[PDB]
Swiss-Prot record, chain B:
Belongs to the universal ribosomal protein uL16 family. Residues 1-24 are annotated as: Disordered. PANTHER family: 50S/60S RIBOSOMAL PROTEIN L16 (PTHR12220), LARGE RIBOSOMAL SUBUNIT PROTEIN UL16M (PTHR12220:SF13). One of its GO terms (molecular function) is structural constituent of ribosome. It comes from Mycolicibacterium smegmatis (strain ATCC 700084 / mc(2)155) (Mycobacterium smegmatis). Gene3D superfamilies: Ribosomal protein L10e/L16 (3.90.1170.10). GO terms for cellular component: cytosolic large ribosomal subunit. CDD domains: Ribosomal_L16_L10e. This is Large ribosomal subunit protein uL16.
Swiss-Prot record, chain D:
GO terms for molecular function: rRNA binding; structural constituent of ribosome; tRNA binding. Pfam families: Ribosomal_L5, Ribosomal_L5_C. This is Large ribosomal subunit protein uL5. The keyword Glycoprotein does not apply. GO terms for cellular component: ribonucleoprotein complex; ribosome. It comes from Mycolicibacterium smegmatis (strain ATCC 700084 / mc(2)155). This is one of the proteins that bind and probably mediate the attachment of the 5S RNA into the large ribosomal subunit, where it forms part of the central protuberance. In the 70S ribosome it contacts protein S13 of the 30S subunit (bridge B1b), connecting the 2 subunits; this bridge is implicated in subunit movement. Contacts the P site tRNA; the 5S rRNA and some of its associated proteins might help stabilize positioning of ribosome-bound tRNAs. Belongs to the universal ribosomal protein uL5 family. Part of the 50S ribosomal subunit; part of the 5S rRNA/L5/L18/L25 subcomplex. Contacts the 5S rRNA and the P site tRNA. Forms a bridge to the 30S subunit in the 70S ribosome. The gene is rplE. It comes from the Bacteria. Keywords: Ribonucleoprotein, Ribosomal protein, RNA-binding, rRNA-binding, tRNA-binding.
Swiss-Prot record, chain F:
The lineage of its organism: Bacteria, Bacillati, Actinomycetota, Actinomycetes, Mycobacteriales. One of its GO terms (cellular component) is ribosome. Keywords: Ribonucleoprotein, Ribosomal protein. NCBIfam families: PRK00504.1 (NF001764), PRK00595.1 (NF001860), rpmG_bact (TIGR01023). GO terms for molecular function: structural constituent of ribosome. Pfam families: Ribosomal_L33. This is Large ribosomal subunit protein bL33A. Gene3D superfamilies: Ribosomal protein L33. HAMAP family: Ribosomal_bL33. Belongs to the bacterial ribosomal protein bL33 family. GO terms for biological process: translation.
UniProtKB/Swiss-Prot annotation, chain G:
PANTHER family: LARGE RIBOSOMAL SUBUNIT PROTEIN BL27M, RIBOSOMAL PROTEIN L27. One of its GO terms (molecular function) is structural constituent of ribosome. The keyword Ribosomal protein applies. GO terms for biological process: translation. It comes from the Bacteria. InterPro entries: Ribosomal_bL27, Ribosomal_bL27_CS. It comes from Mycolicibacterium smegmatis (strain ATCC 700084 / mc(2)155). Keywords: Ribonucleoprotein, Ribosomal protein. Belongs to the bacterial ribosomal protein bL27 family. This is Large ribosomal subunit protein bL27. Signal peptide: none annotated. The gene is rpmA. The keyword Cell membrane does not apply. One of its GO terms (cellular component) is cytosolic large ribosomal subunit.
Length: 48, 136, 103, 182, 126, 48, 79
RNA sequence: GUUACGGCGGUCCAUAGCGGCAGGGAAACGCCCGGUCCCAUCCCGAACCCGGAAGCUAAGCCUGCCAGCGCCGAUGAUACUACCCAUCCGGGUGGAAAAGUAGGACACCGCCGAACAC
RNA sequence: UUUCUUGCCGGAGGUAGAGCUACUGGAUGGCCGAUGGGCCCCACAGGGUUACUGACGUCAGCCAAACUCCGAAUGCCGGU
RNA sequence: UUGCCUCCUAAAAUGUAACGGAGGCGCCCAAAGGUUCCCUCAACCUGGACGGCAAUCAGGUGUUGAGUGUAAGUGCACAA
C-alpha cells in the first residue's frame, strides 16, 4: 500500500441471521453490518 | 482455367531458360509421365489443350496430374506500338519448363491408351517430350 | 530369408573429382562412395553396365558383393544419382553392410 | 495474533485435507490460493467514461483496493473502441487481504445472490483458477442499494497453485466455494 | 505425478535478474585498470567479485559468508557494509583503486547500496 | 502549422535558437532551459 | 501508355569501407549501413546513421559475438 | 587438491538448445514467513526493497542417462562457376555447393569463492 | 615500383546454384473435417450415410528480379 | 516525366542505363528528443456476465511469430 489513496481499510463486524457474527477487515466506514441471507442461512449452502 | 489467383508482381522478367530441371524430374504421382526435353514457356493455353486431349483420350477413367503451373506472367505491349512507354501488361501465363521436367502424369490401366494419350499431349505441347514411366 | 549379394567388381579410384568422374562415366564406370559403419569412406568406380544390370534385376534395394581389388565387401545402394535426361546412373552411395547388423 | 479466518482455517486443516486426499509428495506441492484478481470490463467506456469512474468506485468499495484503470490493448473499429481508451477496472488482492475478501465473498455475497443454486464447477477453470462472471454489483452487500448506479457484474479469478483441475476443485471446495457439482 | 504447469517464481526471478544484469553489462565491462565490481544478492548473503572481462579472471572477492562478516552482528545491510569494506581492502591491496560497480541486475538501494557506499568510504574510487 | 520559432534568453534577450514547434499542439510560447553563450549558464529561453 | 515508375534515389555507396586486416587510424569509417548488419565491436563505435568507425587505431577484424556479425579493431604493436 | 557447489565470463554462442527418465542441499543457491523500517505497485510486499531461518529440495540451479524434436554434418556425386578448347553441340583444368546420406551431439574452456581435505 | 601479374593469407558479400516444413507469395493426396448446408428426429432437445466449402492447419513429393534456412565460382579491399 | 528517399533491375564490394518493374517524400518532435530504470509482443484453452472472431487484462497456457510515427528496405527481442 502506497498511502491512503486506497479506500480506508478497517475491521468490521457482520451480524448475520444465524447469529454467527463474522469479524472481517473491510472498507465499511461505520464498521458494522447485518445480512439476512448468509452462508449458514442460504438453502443450498445450508443443505437445501 | 489455370491462372494464379494472385501474383505478388504482375510484370516479371522473362524466366531464364537455362539448365536442366532440378526438381520435378521424375514421375511421383501417376504411372506414366510426359517429360520435357527442351526449354519452353508452356502457356496455360497449351496446358489446357494437352489436359483435355489426355482426358478425352483416356475417356472415362484414369487420373491426370499437371505438375507444372503456368504462374509466370509474360506481358505484351499493345499492338502496333513503338519501343518504350513502359512495359506491356501481362498477356499470357506460362510455366518455365526446362529439360527433364515431368509436365504431366497419368494413371490409367491400359498402357496402350495411356501412351497414346500422352503422345497426343506431347503433340499439343510446343517442345520435344517423351513418355517416361515410374518403373526405373 | 535372404537375397544373394549380387557380385560386382569395384576398383578404388586413382583420381577423384569432377573430371575424373566424367572420364569414368565415359569409360562406362560409374563413380560410387562406400561409407557407413566402416568409418573411412572409399571411392570406387563400378562397371556401369554390370551395376545397372544388378539394379534392374534386384530393384534399387539389393545387397552387392563389391569386389574391391579382390575383397568381398557387402554393401547396399542407398542413393542413386540418376541424370534426369541421359537416364544413366550418375553416381552411387554404398552403405557397407556388416554381416551381422541391421540397417 | 492477527490472522484472517479463511487463512487460519486453510493453514490449520485444509493443508491436512489436501495432503491426505491427494497424497501430495511435499508441503510445497500442497497447493495454496494465490492472487484473487477482480476484473470488470465496462465495455461502454467509449460512450461514457463516468461509467468506468463508477466501476472504479464500486471496486474500491468492494475489494478495498484502488483499482487499476486497464486500457484497451488495441483499436478495434467494430467495437467503436480506440487504443489507450480505458475499458476495464482491475484489482489484485494478495495475502490476508485476499483471504478476507474471499471470506466476505463466500459468507455474504454469494448467499446474497438473487436465486442462486451454487457455483458452476463445470467451468471450474482448473489450472488457472475459477473465473465466474456476475450479472450485477448490488449483490455485493457492502455497496448500498441506495449507492448503486447501474448493473455492473464482476469477474473473480482466484488464482491458485493448483497443479490441475481436480486439485483446484478440491482446494476451492475445502475452502468453501459452493459448487453445483451434479 | 507432479506437473509444474507454470514457471516458478524462483525461475522467473533468476531469469529476470539475468536479463537486467545482461542489459547492465551491455554498458558495464570492467577493465584490468578499472575492474567491474559484480554484486550478487541473496536473501541470506551478498557477494562481490572484482572481475576483468578482458581476462574473465576475478581479481578480488568478498562475501558475507566469511566468518568475519558472520561475526559482525546487525542486519543484512550491516553485513553488506562489512563486505564492501573487505572488498575495498582486498582491491586496494591488489592494486586496483577505481572500478565500475555492477548491480548484478538488482535495484539500487538496500544491501547493494550499503555495500557500494561502504566500499566508497573504504577507498574504492568506483 | 509548425513555424520557425526563435527562442531568446530571458536574461539577455539574445535570440539564440531557432526551432519549430506546432502552433496547434503547443500554442503557448515555448519555454525551455538553454544557455546563452554570452551568459554562460542555462537560462530560461522563450519564444520571441 | 505511360509508366507510373521511373524514380530511384541516388545510391548511397554503403558497405564495408575497410575490410578485415586493413590498418586504420582512430576514427576511420569501417562500415556504412542502414541498420546494424554489423554491430560495433571492441574499439569500434556506431554513429547516428549506423556508420561503424574506429574508436582506436589498428587492424580491422570481422568476428561474431552472440550470433551478430561484429567489427573489431585489434591493436597493432609498433615494431 | 575432491565435489551430484555457487557466482563471473568466454565459444566464430544450439555439437551448447527443447523435451523425457532417475538424484541431492553440507557451505551455498533457491524457494519460503512476515512488512516494523530504506524502498515499491499506473491496484496488489505479486515484483522491487527490507528483517528471519519456521519449513522444503516440490520447483529454479546442478548431476547421470536417453538421439525423441530441434542443432551440427561430412566424404563422394551433382548443380553452378573462373579461365581455356570448341564453327551451333559440348569438353578440359582449378574452385565447388544447396539438398540428401554416413554420422556427430543430451556441450567444451577459463577465473574466483564455498564444504571437506591439505 | 608505390603500378601490374602470380602464389599465399585476412576479409565482407547474398549473384549463379539450390531450398523453402526457414520466411513472404502461386500447388496432389488421407487426417481431422472443425465454421457450416440438405438429409437430419423436422424440436432449436441428440446424434451420424455426411461423394459438399471441406478451413488454421496435421502428415507425406513440386516454383520467384523485387523469397531466403543456405550459397559458391569470379570479382573487389587489404597484407605478404 | 524532371528534385529527394527505398527496393529490385544491378551480373554476392562501390557504381551502373531505359518513357524498366514498384512505392514513398516536400512531413510528424516539446514528446515520438535526452537520460535512468523497468518490461516483453503474437497464437489457444483448463474458463469466464450480458462478452460474438475480436473488448476483459482472461497469463491460465504458449518462445521471441507483433510493433517500429510514416514508403521501402537494412536493422531492432540484448532490444531500436
Amino acid at each position: 500500500m502506497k498511502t491512503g489513496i486506497h479506500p480506508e481499510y478497517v475491521d468490521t463486524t457482520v451480524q448475520c441471521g444465524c447469529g454467527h457474527s463474522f469479524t472481517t477487515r473491510s472498507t465499511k466506514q461505520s464498521g458494522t453490518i447485518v445480512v439476512e441471507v448468509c452462508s449458514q442461512c442460504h438453502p443450498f449452502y445450508t443443505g437445501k | 482455367m489455370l491462372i494464379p489467383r494472385k501474383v505478388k508482381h504482375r510484370k516479371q522478367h522473362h524466366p531464364e531458360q537455362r539448365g536442366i530441371a532440378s526438381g520435378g524430374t521424375s514421375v511421383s504421382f501417376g504411372d506414366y509421365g510426359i517429360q520435357a526435353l527442351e526449354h519452353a514457356y508452356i502457356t496455360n493455353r497449351q496446358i489446357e489443350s494437352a489436359r483435355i486431349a489426355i482426358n478425352r483420350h483416356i475417356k472415362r477413367g484414369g487420373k491426370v496430374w499437371i505438375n507444372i503451373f503456368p504462374d509466370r506472367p509474360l506481358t505484351k505491349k499493345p499492338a502496333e506500338t513503338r519501343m518504350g512507354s513502359g512495359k506491356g501488361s501481362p498477356e499470357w501465363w506460362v510455366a518455365n519448363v526446362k529439360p527433364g521436367r515431368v509436365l504431366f502424369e497419368l494413371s490409367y490401366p491400359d498402357e496402350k491408351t495411356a501412351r497414346d494419350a500422352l503422345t497426343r499431349a506431347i503433340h499439343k505441347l510446343p517442345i520435344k517430350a517423351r513418355i517416361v514411366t515410374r518403373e526405373e | 530369408t535372404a537375397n544373394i549379394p549380387n557380385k560386382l567388381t569395384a576398383n578404388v579410384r586413382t583420381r577423384t573429382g569432377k573430371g575424373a568422374s566424367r572420364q569414368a562415366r565415359r569409360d562406362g564406370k560409374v563413380p560410387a562412395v562406400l561409407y557407413g559403419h566402416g568409418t573411412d569412406p572409399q571411392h570406387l568406380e563400378l562397371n556401369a553396365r554390370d551395376f545397372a544390370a544388378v539394379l534392374r534385376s534386384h530393384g534399387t534395394n539389393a545387397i552387392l558383393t563389391l569386389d574391391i581389388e579382390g575383397t568381398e565387401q557387402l554393401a547396399l545402394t542407398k542413393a542413386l544419382d540418376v541424370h534426369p535426361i541421359r537416364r544413366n546412373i550418375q553416381h552411387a552411395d554404398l552403405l557397407v553392410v556388416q554381416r551381422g547388423e541391421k540397417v | 495474533k492477527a490472522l484472517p479466518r479463511l487463512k487460519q482455517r486453510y493453514r490449520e486443516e485444509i493443508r491436512e485435507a489436501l495432503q491426505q486426499e491427494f497424497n501430495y509428495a511435499n508441503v510445497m506441492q500442497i497447493p495454496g490460493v494465490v492472487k484473487v484478481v477482480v476484473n470488470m470490463g465496462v465495455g461502454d467506456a467509449a460512450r461514457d467514461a463516468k461509467l468506468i469512474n463508477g466501476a472504479i468506485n464500486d471496486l474500491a468499495l468492494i475489494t478495498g483496493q484502488k483499482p487499476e484503470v486497464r486500457r484497451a490493448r488495441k483499436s478495434i473499429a467494430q467495437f467503436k473502441l480506440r487504443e489507450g481508451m480505458p475499458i476495464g477496472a482491475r484489482v489484485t488482492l494478495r495475502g490476508d487481504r485476499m483471504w478476507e475478501f474471499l471470506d466476505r465473498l463466500i459468507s455474504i455475497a454469494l448467499p446474497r445472490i438473487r436465486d442462486f443454486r451454487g457455483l458452476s464447477p463445470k467451468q471450474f477453470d482448473g489450472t488457472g483458477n475459477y473465473t465466474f462472471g456476475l450479472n450485477e454489483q448490488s449483490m455485493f452487500h457492502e455497496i448500498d442499494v441506495d449507492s448503486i448506479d447501474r448493473p455492473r457484474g464482476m469477474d473473480i479469478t482466484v488464482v491458485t497453485t493448483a497443479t490441475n483441475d481436480a486439485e483446484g476443485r478440491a482446494l476451492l471446495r475445502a475452502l468453501g466455494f459452493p459448487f453445483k457439482e451434479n | 505425478a507432479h506437473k509444474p504447469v507454470g514457471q516458478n517464481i524462483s525461475e522467473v526471478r533468476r531469469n529476470a535478474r539475468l536479463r537486467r544484469h545482461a542489459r547492465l553489462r551491455k554498458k558495464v565491462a570492467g577493465t584490468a585498470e578499472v575492474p567491474r565490481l559484480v554484486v550478487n544478492r541473496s536473501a541470506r548473503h551478498i557477494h562481490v567479485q572484482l572481475v576483468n572481462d578482458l581476462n574473465g579472471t576475478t581479481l578480488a572477492a568478498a562475501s558475507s559468508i566469511e566468518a568475519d562478516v558472520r561475526a559482525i552482528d546487525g542486519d543484512k545491510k550491516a553485513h553488506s557494509v562489512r563486505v564492501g569494506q573487505l572488498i575495498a581492502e582486498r582491491a586496494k591491496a591488489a592494486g586496483v583503486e577505481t572500478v565500475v560497480f555492477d548491480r548484478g541486475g538488482y535495484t539500487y538501494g538496500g544491501r547493494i547500496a550499503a555495500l557500494a557506499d561502504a566500499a566508497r568510504e573504504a577507498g574504492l574510487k568506483f | 502549422v509548425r513555424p520557425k520559432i526563435t527562442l531568446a534568453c530571458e536574461v539577455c534577450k539574445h535570440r539564440n535558437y531557432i526551432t519549430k514547434k506546432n502552433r496547434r499542439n503547443d500554442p503557448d510560447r515555448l519555454e525551455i532551459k538553454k544557455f546563452c553563450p554570452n551568459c554562460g549558464t542555462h537560462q530560461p529561453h522563450k519564444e520571441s | 501508355s505511360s509508366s507510373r515508375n521511373g524514380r530511384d534515389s541516388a545510391a548511397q555507396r554503403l558497405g564495408v569501407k575497410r575490410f578485415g586486416g586493413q590498418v586504420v587510424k582512430a576514427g576511420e569509417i569501417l562500415v556504412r549501413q542502414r541498420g546494424t548488419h554489423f554491430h560495433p565491436g571492441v574499439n569500434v563505435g556506431r554513429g547516428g546513421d549506423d556508420t561503424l568507425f574506429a574508436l582506436a587505431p589498428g587492424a580491422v577484424e570481422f568476428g561474431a559475438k552472440r550470433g551478430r556479425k561484429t567489427v573489431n579493431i585489434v591493436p597493432v604493436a609498433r615494431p
